[PDB]
Amino acid sequence: CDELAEIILSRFSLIMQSKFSKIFLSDIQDETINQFINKLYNGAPFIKTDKYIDPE
């Protein structure tokens, strides 16, 4: 049970650690991001922006 407890400690820590997110980098109050997220979350096959947002 000592060997089983350690594995569960590692297995549970991996569950809580494994959480994914999408991170947008921009100026701290650039209201384009909020508009961009609103389009992206909903359906948006095509989004038009400028060169300065640099999606890649």
């Binding site: 650039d30 209201e31 384009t32 508009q35 922006t49």
Partner: protein
Amino acid sequence: LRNGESDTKRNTQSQNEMNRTGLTKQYLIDNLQKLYSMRDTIFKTYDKECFLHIW
């Protein structure tokens, strides 16, 4: 019997002043190419930090 004596004292004080001015103007075609984005890059930093980038 003839005896002679002679003295002399000189004292010359001089002053100079020389002012030089030059202006070498060089015409390179390379410096003309770098002229292009000199004014434009002023408003590329304005665009990125003050205006909305989504249509």
